[PDB]
Amino acid sequence: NPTLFVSYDQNGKKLSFANWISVLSPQDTPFVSMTGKESINQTIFSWQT
Amino acid sequence: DALASVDGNNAHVEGSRAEDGEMKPTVIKSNVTQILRKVVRVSDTANTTA
């Protein structure tokens, strides 16, 4: 029922919201994400040089 | 409008001598018609909200 088309004609709007958050300051650390981690089950590890 | 009244007495003496009848014909009533609009005026930006 289009009656006014000013403020209340189409109720249930999205409030001008988007589904993506913007971190204004860069806080990523590609170093660790690049260096892959390896699993160890035991606790008697040993490496050679 | 109506019918002719009774006029009460209705005696007669063998002769009418009327005035071409007392018909008093019907009355014409009339009536007029009007308009009803109820305008509506909406904006274009208010026709796309939720």
From TrEMBL, chain A:
This is Major head protein.
